Amino acid sequence: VHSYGYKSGTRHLFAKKFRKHGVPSVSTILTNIKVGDYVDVVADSAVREGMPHKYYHGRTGIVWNVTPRGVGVIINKPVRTRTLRKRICVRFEHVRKSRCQEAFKAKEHQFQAYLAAKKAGKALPPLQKSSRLGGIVRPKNVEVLARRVADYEAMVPY
Amino acid sequence: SKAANPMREIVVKKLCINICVGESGDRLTRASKVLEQLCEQTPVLSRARLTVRTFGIRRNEKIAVHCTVRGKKAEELLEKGLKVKEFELKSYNFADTGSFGFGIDEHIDLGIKYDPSTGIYGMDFYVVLGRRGERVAHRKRKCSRVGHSHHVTKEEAMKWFEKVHDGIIFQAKKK
Amino acid sequence: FVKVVKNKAYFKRFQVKYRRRREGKTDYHARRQMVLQDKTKFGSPKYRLVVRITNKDIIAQIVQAKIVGDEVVMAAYAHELPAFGIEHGLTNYAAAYATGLLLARRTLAKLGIADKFQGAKEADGSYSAVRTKKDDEGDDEERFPFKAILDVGLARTTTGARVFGVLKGAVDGGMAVPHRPNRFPGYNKEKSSLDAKVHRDRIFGKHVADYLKQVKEEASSNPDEKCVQFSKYMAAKVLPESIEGMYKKAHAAIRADPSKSLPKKAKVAHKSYKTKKLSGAEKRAAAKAKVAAIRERL
RNA sequence: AUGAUUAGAGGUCGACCUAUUCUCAAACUUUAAAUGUGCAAACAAACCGUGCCUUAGCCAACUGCAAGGCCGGAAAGAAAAGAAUUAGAGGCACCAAGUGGGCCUUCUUCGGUAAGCGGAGCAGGCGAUGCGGAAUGAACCGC
RNA sequence: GGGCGGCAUAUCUGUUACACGACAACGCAGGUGUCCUAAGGCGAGCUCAGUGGGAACAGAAAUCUCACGUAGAACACAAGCGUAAAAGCUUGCUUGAUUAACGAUUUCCAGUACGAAUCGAGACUGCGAAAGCAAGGCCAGCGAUCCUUUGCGAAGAAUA
RNA sequence: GAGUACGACCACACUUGAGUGAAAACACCAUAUCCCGUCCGAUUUGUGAAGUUAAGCACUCACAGGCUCAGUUAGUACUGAGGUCAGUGAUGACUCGGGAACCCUGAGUGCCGUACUCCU
RNA sequence: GCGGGGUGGAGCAGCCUAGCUCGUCGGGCUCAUAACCCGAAGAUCGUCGGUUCAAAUCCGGCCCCCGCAACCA
Ligand SMILES: [Mg+2]
Ligand SMILES: [Mg+2]
Ligand SMILES: [Mg+2]
Ligand SMILES: [Mg+2]
Ligand SMILES: [Mg+2]
Ligand SMILES: [Mg+2]
Ligand SMILES: [Mg+2]
Ligand SMILES: [Mg+2]
Ligand SMILES: [Mg+2]
Ligand SMILES: [Mg+2]
Ligand SMILES: [Mg+2]
Ligand SMILES: [Mg+2]
Ligand SMILES: [Mg+2]
Ligand SMILES: [Mg+2]
Ligand SMILES: [Mg+2]
Ligand SMILES: [Mg+2]
Ligand SMILES: [Mg+2]
Ligand SMILES: [Mg+2]
Ligand code: NA
Q: Where are the alpha helices (DSSP H) in chain A?
A: 26-29, 102-119, 149-154
Number of separate helices (H) and strands (E) present in chain A: 3, 5
Closest nucleotide to C11: CA versus each C1': F66
Between the CA of C51 and the C1' of E43, what is the distance in angstroms? 21
Residue-by-residue DSSP string for B33-48: HHHHHHHSS--EEEE-
Q: Which of C24, C153, C156 sits opposite B143 (nearest CB)?
A: C24
Return the H-helix or E-strand segment holding B26: helix B26-39
Q: Which of B24, B103, B37, B14 has its CA nearest to residue B64?
A: B24
Using an 8 Å CB-CB cutoff, list residues of chain A that contact chain C.
Answer: 19-24, 26-27, 29-34, 66-71, 92
Residue C147 zone, left/alpha/beta (φ > 0; ψ -120 to 50; rest):
beta
Q: Is the CB of C15 under 7 A from strand E?
A: yes
Look at residue A107 and give its three-state secondary structure: helix
Q: Which of C32, C39, C42 sits opposite A26 (nearest CB)?
A: C32
A12 is in an annotated binding site: yes
Contacts of C13 in chain A (CB under 8 A): 19
- Nearest-CA distance from C151 to chain B in Å? 15
Look at residue A64 and give its three-state secondary structure: strand
Chains touching C by CB (3 or more pairs below 8 Å)? A, B
CB A41 within 8 A of CB A58: yes
Between the CA of B40 and the C1' of D59, what is the distance in angstroms? 60
Contacts of C53 in chain B (CB under 8 A): none
Residue-by-residue DSSP string for B62-98: EEEEEEEE-THHHHHHHHHHHHHTTTEEEGGGB-TTS
Look at residue A93 and give its three-state secondary structure: helix
CA atoms of A68 and A47, how far apart (whole Å): 16
Amino acid at B166: D
Contacts with B37 (C-beta within 8 Å, 6 or more apart), sequence order: B112
Contacts with B84 (C-beta within 8 Å, 6 or more apart), sequence order: B104, B109, B110
Q: How far is CA A35 from CA A58, A100, C39, in A?
A: 20, 16, 11
Does C43 sit within 8 Å of A30, measured CB to CB?
yes
CA atoms of B115 and B20, how far apart (whole Å): 20
Resolution of the PDB structure in angstroms: 2.5
CB C102 within 8 A of CB C258: yes
CA atoms of C195 and C125, how far apart (whole Å): 8
β-pairing verdict for B168-170 and B88-90: parallel
* Ion ligand 3 nearby residues (CB, 5 A): C 30
Q: Is the CB of B54 under 7 A from strand G?
A: no
CA atoms of A88 and A54, how far apart (whole Å): 12
CA atoms of C43 and C65, how far apart (whole Å): 10
CB C33 within 8 A of CB C46: no
β-pairing verdict for C187-188 and B88-90: unpaired
CB B98 within 8 A of CB B11: no
Break chain A down into helix, strand, coil percent, rounded to 5.
20, 20, 55
Contacts of C15 in chain A (CB under 8 A): 19-22
Does A27 sit within 8 Å of C31, measured CB to CB?
no
Does A68 sit within 8 Å of C32, measured CB to CB?
no
Break chain B down into helix, strand, coil percent, rounded to 5.
30, 25, 45
Return the H-helix or E-strand segment holding B123: strand B123-130
CA atoms of B167 and B85, how far apart (whole Å): 10
Q: Is the dihedral of CA A19, A24, A27, A33 positive or negative?
A: positive
**Which residue's CA shows the smallest distance to C1' of E27?**
A1
Three-state secondary structure of chain C = CCCCCCCHHHHHHCCCCCHHHHCCCCCHHHHHHHCCCCHHHCCCCCEEEEEEECCCCEEEEEEECCCCCCEEEEEEEHHHHHHHCCCCCCCCHHHHHHHHHHHHHHHHHHCCCCCCCCCCCCCCCCCCCCCCCCCCCCCCCCCCCCECEEECCCCCCCCCCHHHHHHHHHHHCCCECCCCHHHCCCEECHHHEECHHHHHHHHCCHHHHHHHHHHHHHHHHCCCCCCCCCHHHHHCCCCHHHHHHHHHHHHHHHHHCCCCCCCCCCCCCCCCCCCCCCCHHHHHHHHHHHHHHHHHCC
Q: Is the CB of B51 under 7 A from strand G?
A: yes
CA atoms of C238 and A120, how far apart (whole Å): 75
Question: Quick one: C262 exposed, middle or buried, by C-beta within 10 A (0-12, 13-18, 19+)?
Answer: exposed
Does C153 sit within 8 Å of B140, measured CB to CB?
no
Amino acid at C117: F
CA atoms of A98 and A37, how far apart (whole Å): 8
Chains touching A by CB (3 or more pairs below 8 Å)? C
Q: Is the CB of A67 under 7 A from strand E?
A: yes
CB B88 within 8 A of CB B16: no
Strand partners, C185: none
CA atoms of C152 and C26, how far apart (whole Å): 11
Contacts of A66 in chain C (CB under 8 A): 39-40, 42
CA atoms of A138 and B57, how far apart (whole Å): 93
Q: Is the CB of B139 under 7 A from strand G?
A: no
Ligand closest in space to the Cα of A48: 16
CA atoms of A119 and C248, how far apart (whole Å): 67
Question: Quick one: C60 exposed, middle or buried, by C-beta within 10 A (0-12, 13-18, 19+)?
Answer: buried
CA atoms of A43 and A94, how far apart (whole Å): 5
Q: How far apart are the first and last CA of chain C?
A: 34
Q: How far is CA B59 from CA B25, B161, C109, in A?
A: 15, 39, 64
Does C32 sit within 8 Å of A20, measured CB to CB?
no
CA atoms of A5 and A14, how far apart (whole Å): 14
Strand partners, A85: A76
Method: cryo-EM
Does C23 sit within 8 Å of B141, measured CB to CB?
no
Between the CA of A12 and the C1' of D125, what is the distance in angstroms? 38
CA atoms of A86 and A74, how far apart (whole Å): 6
Closest nucleotide to C8: CA versus each C1': F65
- Nearest-CA distance from C24 to chain B in Å? 4
Look at residue B157 and give its three-state secondary structure: helix
